[PDB]
């Protein structure tokens with residue numbers, strides 16, 4: 001039934017060995033969880049999707065890992081209610097292709113479509129449209145959670161099980177196995193964006209452009225950010241913003257199949273782009289850490305609360321002065337947060353950087369951790385396998401609430417991961 005397998009996060013770091021169950025048979029999955037429960041816990045079980053998380057949340061050294069990628073059936077698509085009912089193992093690429101002809105758009109899209117719905121919910125992922133759409137959890141209408149008791153629990157965001165539902169969103173698999181979910185899609189009439197580009201010359205300008213009220217004009221916005229240049233060029237950005245195009249906005253040639261699947265003159269208006277172009281160059285650089293890992297690069301993502309913009313500038317300054325130089329930097333202003341205790345996004349200044357691994361780096365990122373922490377920010381479990389339980393708990397003031405919910409639902413700790421042990425969420 002199971003295969004012992006060396007697992008790592010996306011960037012190939014922090015390996016551990018788990019027994020991997022890989023079956024399309026939901027009943028075998030139910031049986032396996034039950035068997036772990038009847039052994040009284042042991043080293044537990046965790047779900048795994050496509051392994052795009054950079055962290056150690058989708059592995060469980062010495063225990064069970066359940067590869068959910070074979071549960072990939074799309075059960076129903078409904079264009080009136082905009083609801084799709086899909087297995088947790090279906091990936092966003094797969095769903096995007098299946099839903100487009102219905103005029104439905106995946107409501108939150110990360111930098112790669114090679115993630116499962118289960119992984120999307122478990123890490124409450126965010127996209128270029130976060131300030132307008134919230135995160136992936138905001139669009140979950142129901143989900144079926146296989147819990148430690150071996151029961152499949154139907155959860156809703158306002159029902160009697162709302163508490164468990166919202167601990168599952170962003171819960172990193174630690175409430176049980178998401179089997180299946182119903183997602184509310186976004187109506188669209190085309191598969192293209194109409195984009196506006198702007199290039200800033202400085203950090204202050206980047207921040208000004210994000211605080212001048214223009215963000216409200218775009219459903220989607222992100223920026224490519226300079227973290228190496230000496231000030232005042234430090235913080236300058238290439239900002240890509242836009243919204244889904246209506247068919248009248250499409251160039252003549254493309255109006256045929258509008259829902260088709262798949263230095264400083266970087267300034268433009270009303271350019272029409274498909275998903276790949278609009279998100280460029282995220283797709284071509286996505287394999288980077290995996291291609292040169294585990295020894296090449298350390299990704300590092302954090303968000304600082306909106307009101308702490310000065311503290312945010314200081315961290316950027318510290319990064320530039322450090323000697324650790326990152327070219328791949330993505331920046332965004334997050335919008336309002338949701339109600340999941342462990343959700344990563346909060347409104348504020350979000351950036352992912354990617355350091356070359358060098359002498360002094362580990363010590364340096366521990367320094368960043370402290371600053372992010374004190375300034376009221378957080379790290380993201382999808383991007384971390386290095387921080388401490390103390391640091392993480394301090395970054396998530398709702399962690400004890402979350403742990404309490406996890407205790408109600410998994411008293412024997414049937415669910416466990418390397419991450420849960422490292423960060424003391426277990």
Ligand SMILES: Cc1cc2nc3c(=O)[nH]c(=O)nc-3n(C[C@H](O)[C@H](O)[C@H](O)COP(=O)(O)OP(=O)(O)OC[C@H]3O[C@@H](n4cnc5c(N)ncnc54)[C@H](O)[C@@H]3O)c2cc1C
Pocket residue numbers: 010046047048049050051052053054057058059068088089109110111112114115116117118119120122123124125126127128171172173174176177178179285286287382
């Ligand atoms: C190139 C690249 C770009 C990215 N861009 C973004 C981005 O723009 N925004 C963003 O928020 N993230 C981004 N990520 C991170 C990624 O979206 C998340 O880590 C996501 O959870 C990965 O999904 P997965 O199916 O691969 O999950 P895995 O990596 O396999 O697992 C991640 C977590 O989900 C849990 N899980 C998976 N399936 C289930 C299930 N069926 N039931 C219960 N729990 C489950 C696992 O236990 C684990 O805790 C990116 C990653 C890469 C490699």
Ligand SMILES: C[C@@H](NC(=O)c1cc([N+](=O)[O-])cc(C(F)(F)F)c1)c1ccccc1
Pocket residue numbers: 109110111112126127128129222281282283285286301328329330331332350351352
């Ligand atoms: C790891 C991966 N991240 C992203 O694509 C990404 C990160 C972020 N982020 O939160 O830093 C946001 C986005 C967004 F919002 F635009 F969808 C995408 C990546 C890929 C290629 C270059 C740099 C980062």
